[PDB]
Amino acid sequence: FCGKGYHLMSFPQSAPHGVVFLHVTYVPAQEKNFTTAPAICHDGKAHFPREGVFVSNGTHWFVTQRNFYEPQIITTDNTFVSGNCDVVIGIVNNTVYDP
Amino acid sequence: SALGKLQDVVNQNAQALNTLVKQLSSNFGAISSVLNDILSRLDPPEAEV
Amino acid sequence: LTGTGVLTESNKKFLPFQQFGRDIADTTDAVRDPQTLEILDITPCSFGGV
Amino acid sequence: DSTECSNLLLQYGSFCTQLNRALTGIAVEQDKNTQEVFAQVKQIYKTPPIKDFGGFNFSQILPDPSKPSKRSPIEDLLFNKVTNGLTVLPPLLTDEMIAQYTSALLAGTITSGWTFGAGPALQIPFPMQMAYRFNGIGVTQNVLYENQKLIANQFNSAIGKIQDSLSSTP
Amino acid sequence: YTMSLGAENSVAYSNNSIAIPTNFTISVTTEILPVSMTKTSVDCTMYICG
Ligand SMILES: *[C@@H]1O[C@H](CO)[C@@H](O[C@@H]2O[C@H](CO)[C@@H](O)[C@H](O)[C@H]2NC(C)=O)[C@H](O)[C@H]1NC(C)=O
Ligand SMILES: *[C@@H]1O[C@H](CO)[C@@H](O[C@@H]2O[C@H](CO)[C@@H](O)[C@H](O)[C@H]2NC(C)=O)[C@H](O)[C@H]1NC(C)=O
Ligand SMILES: *[C@@H]1O[C@H](CO)[C@@H](O[C@@H]2O[C@H](CO)[C@@H](O)[C@H](O)[C@H]2NC(C)=O)[C@H](O)[C@H]1NC(C)=O
Ligand SMILES: *[C@@H]1O[C@H](CO)[C@@H](O[C@@H]2O[C@H](CO)[C@@H](O)[C@H](O)[C@H]2NC(C)=O)[C@H](O)[C@H]1NC(C)=O
Ligand SMILES: *[C@@H]1O[C@H](CO)[C@@H](O[C@@H]2O[C@H](CO)[C@@H](O)[C@H](O)[C@H]2NC(C)=O)[C@H](O)[C@H]1NC(C)=O
Ligand SMILES: *[C@@H]1O[C@H](CO)[C@@H](O)[C@H](O)[C@H]1NC(C)=O
Ligand SMILES: *[C@@H]1O[C@H](CO)[C@@H](O)[C@H](O)[C@H]1NC(C)=O
């Protein structure tokens, strides 16, 4: 509705019998492959991200925000626990750090 | 051609005005397209037609 | 040729054969007066909406 | 072909030009409408050959390779259910290219989420895409993950009911 | 020629891989929308009859 991409803001400009909108939008770029999982299995419990997504660079598991790569250590502060590991299809085993 | 949307509206309105002005030159089956020529050439019974 | 308008001086270089002038609507816009052969411009009298 | 009729028609001026120009404007407006509706992507996406979407079935909406028109079964049913100086101009986009545009949109929204509509197509598994959509309507991801088989079965049953309702309602 | 619809792109879909952006582009685009026309009024009596 306000340009191509994720809309940030817009500027109006007057034109003869018209209006010109300068739509400032956010475009993602330089994407990278990662191996992802729906949940983390730890101590017989399933951990799900509060706002982000589990990614792996090959050996280590992290959680990052969805629209920008910013890897962080999977802790209890950014995950929530629901159920055991027997139900979620594709759950992987990884440690969950406790601050 | 960046500003073609406004120029399209301007061209359509100017072309409609030009067509409306051009339609005065047609007699539509009458002897002349000029009203003064008809009013100066004919009696009112046929100038009425 | 009948009509109403203000007759003013003009700067249109008519060729010898040329007598009058016509606009897009075909209404006469300039005329050459007989007897004196001068070229008179025909400008419609002022009008507008009240 | 009457020349006397055209000689009398020239007395009325440029009415025919106005009618032809209005119809030409309508004719290009239809192509502009189709261009604005269907051509919202400049990349023609394809689904992967393996249809492993975590139990979700899209065969009724993906194009059928056995059909020469490359239409979906639903689109094929939709196309089956619709039945002096005059000329009909053909549309600029044929039905095959409109079907190709819809196939590209379906492949983009299945394999890449809403990311292809805002930039480059970023691949994501479909049971994760669904969880993101669940979080968009305010339901936690765990609910989707725990009950993924039931949601896939409900989705497939609803798609089949859509095809049955379109085939059973005139 | 028969017009192409787009460049062909095959999305590398698999059931356990995701693509995450590592950078961004701030893109400014123009959108031109007409608002009004020229306000034209025609004296119907003067147009038909003068
Ligand atoms: C995945 O990311 C982690 C974290 O950045 C990497 O682990 C680090 O790797 C560097 C380079 O060998 C070491 O100097 C650090 O000591 C490592 N940190 C830890 C906590 O082990 C890991 O190498 C990355 N893996 C791949 C395949 O890129
Ligand atoms: C993830 O961890 C669980 C629990 O530590 C593993 O489940 C065990 O698997 C072994 C052999 O596969 C069994 O003998 C145990 O009885 C299982 N324990 C439970 C509690 O189920 C699971 O295999 C691990 N998965 C991976 C991929 O390493
Ligand atoms: C997805 O749905 C289609 C259609 O509902 C399934 O295709 C059916 O498969 C069964 C058994 O294989 C056949 O008896 C039906 O005739 C098929 N229907 C059609 C319309 O072809 C398909 O099996 C489902 N699953 C997958 C993985 O594609
Ligand atoms: C993520 O990985 C996939 C597969 O490993 C990459 O897809 C391949 O990309 C190359 C180069 O563009 C193509 O020649 C292959 O045909 C692609 N394979 C498939 C199955 O599509 C993809 O490019 C990777 N993504 C990134 C950002 O590097
Ligand atoms: C993200 O992208 C921006 C540009 O889109 C990169 O900034 C450029 O970096 C190169 C090398 O450092 C410079 O030569 C250019 O002058 C920079 N451009 C601008 C506009 O500043 C940036 O480095 C990228 N970051 C990452 C992490 O990839
Ligand atoms: C993904 O597919 C592979 C086979 O290609 C399978 O082994 C694996 O279990 C699947 N994972 C999920 C989460 O469906
Ligand atoms: C009379 O008109 C002719 C042209 O029609 C012109 O040459 C002549 O000078 C005019 N004479 C007078 C007295 O106006």
Q: Cβ separation of B25 and C26 shorter than 8 Å?
A: yes
Question: Which residue shows structure tokens 């925000």?
Answer: A65
Q: Do chains B and A touch (3 or more CB pairs under 8 A)?
A: yes
Compute CA distances D139 → D129, D142, D158, whole Å: 13, 9, 21
- Chain E partners within 8 Å of D52 (Cβ): 15
- Cβ proximity of A16 and B13 under 8 Å: no
The secondary structure of chain D, three-state, reads CCHHHHHHHHHHCCHHHHHHHHHHHHHHHHHHHHHHHHCCCCEEEECCCCCCCCCCCCCCCCCCCCCCCCCCHHHHHHHHHCCCCCCCCCCCCCHHHHHHHHHHHHHHHHHCCCCCCCCCCCCCCHHHHHHHHHHHCCCCHHHHHHCHHHHHHHHHHHHHHHHHHHHHCC
Buried b (16+ CB within 10 A) or exposed e, B20-31: eeebbbbeeeee
Residue A13 and residue D26: Cα distance in Å, rounded? 30
The encoded tokens of residue C46 equal 């002022």
Dihedrals φ, ψ of D24, to 5°? -65, -40
8 A C-beta contact, residue D110 and residue D126: yes
Report chain E's C-alpha Rg in angstroms.
28
Contact between A44 and A98 (Cβ < 8 Å)? no
Find tokens 């590398």 and name the residue.
E12
Sheet with strand A40-42: strands edge to edge? A79-81, A45-49, A40-42, A92-93
Chains E and A touch (3+ CB pairs under 8 A): yes
Task: For residues E35 and A31, give the distance between their C-alpha atoms in angstroms, rounded to a whole number.
Answer: 40
Strand ranges inside B1-49, DSSP E = none
User: A15-44 burial by CB neighbour count: b if 16+ within 10 A, else e?
Assistant: eeebebbebbbbbbeebeebebbbbbbbee
For residues D150 and A63, what is the distance between their CA atoms, to the nearest angstrom?
Answer: 28
b/e code D8-31 from CB counts within 10 Å (16+ = b) = eeeeebbeeeeeeeeeeeeeeeee
- Please tell me the number of Cα atoms within 13 Å of D167 on its side-chain side: 12
In Å, how far from its chain's centre is CA A18?
A: 40
Asked if D149 and D82 count as a contact pair (C-beta separation under 8 A), the reply is: no
Which one-letter DSSP state was computed for residue C44?
A: P
CA distance D111 to D20: 46
Contact D91, D30 (CB under 8 A): yes
Report yes or no: A19 and E33 within 8 Å, Cβ to Cβ: yes
User: How buried is B13 (Cβ within 10 angstroms: 0-12 exposed, 13-18 middle, 19+ buried)?
Assistant: middle
| Both structure tokens of D117 | 């509509």
D128 vs A31, A38, A82: nearest CB: A38
- Is B7 exposed, middle or buried (CB count within 10 Å of its CB: 0-12, 13-18, 19+)? middle
CA of D119 relative to ligand 3 center, distance in Å: 34
- In three-state secondary structure terms, D121 is coil
Q: Which of E31, D114, E30, D104 is nearest to A28 (CA)?
A: D114
Helices (H) and strands (E) in chain B, counts: 3, 0
Pairing mode of beta strands A92-93, A40-42: parallel
Q: Please name every residue paired with E20 in a beta bridge, in sequence order, or none if there are none.
A: A32
Nearest CA to ligand 6 atom 10: E15
Reduced to 3 states (helix: H, G, I; strand: E, B; else coil), residue E20 is strand
Q: What is the Cα A55 distance to its own chain's centre? A: 9
Q: How far apart are CA B17 and CA B15, in angstroms?
A: 5
Q: Which residues of C fall within a CB distance of 8 Å from B37?
A: 2
CB D159 within 8 A of CB D61: yes
User: Is the separation of the CB atoms in D121 and D57 below 8 Å?
Assistant: no
CA distances from C50 to A61, E38, E43 (A): 80, 19, 11
| Residue D53, C-beta contacts closer than 8 angstroms, at least 6 positions apart | D110, D126, D127, E15
Torsion of CA A69, A74, A80, A86, to 10 degrees: 110
Beta-sheet strand order (sheet of C39-43): C6-8, C39-43, C28-32, C21-22
Q: Measured between CB atoms, which of E38, E47, E50 is closest to B13?
A: E38
